[PDB]
């Protein structure tokens, strides 16, 4: 169980984040 590769706001899908964020918009990772 790992969702979280990442450990920064800048990301290119929303796949691209960690589990604390799920959504990735204009380029960076957001919780929704």
Known sequence: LLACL???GRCSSN???CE?????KRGSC???
């Open 30 to 32: 957001v919780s929704s």
């Open 20 to 24: 604390l964020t799920p959504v990735c």
């Open 15 to 17: 796949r691209d984040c």
């Open 6 to 8: 990442f450990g920064n």
